[PDB]
Design a protein around this ligand. Sequence first.
Ligand code: HEM
Length: 153
Amino acid sequence: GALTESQAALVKSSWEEFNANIPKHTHRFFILVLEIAPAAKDLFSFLKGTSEVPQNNPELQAHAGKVFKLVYEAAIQLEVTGVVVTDATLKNLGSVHVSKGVADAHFPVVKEAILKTIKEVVGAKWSEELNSAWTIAYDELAIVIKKEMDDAA
Ligand code: HEM
């Protein structure tokens, strides 16, 4: 709906805070994914076969860091331009996700795990506005990735 300039500023603030402790917060993110949907474990190469979510895995860390940064960058582009631009990068993400057996109905899983991660990251700074902002950003980004999935047969 929104992303006013103060909504964008909040996504940016919260993303910085997230990024201040990548080892902690990415690990936390993957724990929350599996609590929502244990079956999702099998899609991720760095998880498959583990007992617990690894705490010092650079593949896990770079993957989840990239996820959060793309949603934040989507937030700023919606706020500045009024859209999410479909580029070659998101086109490539559409093909990638179809290849790894990701489907439209998986996207709400990663959404809730992002909202809960950010909630834990900001602590007492959490607000309704913050939550709405990451929700819009995620949804608009997901629309474009799903279109390219649908498109990337
Ligand atoms: C807005 C939502 C999403 C974003 C921004 C996103 C971002 C990405 C990125 C950046 C990559 C890595 C591309 C590369 O470096 O090759 C990737 C890979 C992947 N994603 Fe997503 N993702 C999203 C949603 C999902 C969902 C809903 C699922 C399924 C639960 C999922 C599962 C996967 C898997 C299995 C991989 C491959 C990684 C591997 O081979 O271990 N993603 N995603």
